[PDB]
Design a protein around this ligand. Sequence first.
Ligand SMILES: CC(C)(C)[C@@H]1CC[C@H](CO)N(c2ncnc3[nH]ccc23)C1
Length: 167
Amino acid sequence: VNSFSGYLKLTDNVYIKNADIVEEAKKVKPTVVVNAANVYLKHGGGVAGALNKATNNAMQVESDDYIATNGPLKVGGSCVLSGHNLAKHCLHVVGPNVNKGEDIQLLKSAYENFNQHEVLLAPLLSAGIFGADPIHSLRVCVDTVRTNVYLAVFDKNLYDKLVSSFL
Ligand SMILES: CC(C)(C)[C@@H]1CC[C@H](CO)N(c2ncnc3[nH]ccc23)C1
């Protein structure tokens, strides 16, 4: 039993809700919140910009030190950093950005990072400003993640389409 509330159950391990991931994280304080990161951990917009803003830019400060030490992530890769005031940890995961021409096949590799964590609050990878089809992202999530994932979808219209079209 966990404290996630109001989710629709899609499969044994995947749950979905129309919610603002920032507000969800602040309420639940999950062990792991997933960020829709880029390889430079520049949290300018989309989910990343919103999460970082909620940390009063502390996420960005920590991220800049991480990059200065380690260099950029790989597309499809991840790193674990602090969750600041939102979660114990933030798993920064880089899905392919279609608006940069990146290979959508890397979306499965991106979701594989979730399997290193027993329970996660997450957005749909590569959705939103990353340019991929969110219906496809949900399919890859369900077919790749085996741990317990609670998906927050900001757009109510999109949430309804994701549910109604789910096979
Ligand atoms: C449109 C984007 C590529 C930016 C993605 C797409 C999937 C959903 C749709 O809104 N996104 C979010 N989900 C949950 N919480 C969120 N907080 C802020 C954004 C957001 C944004």
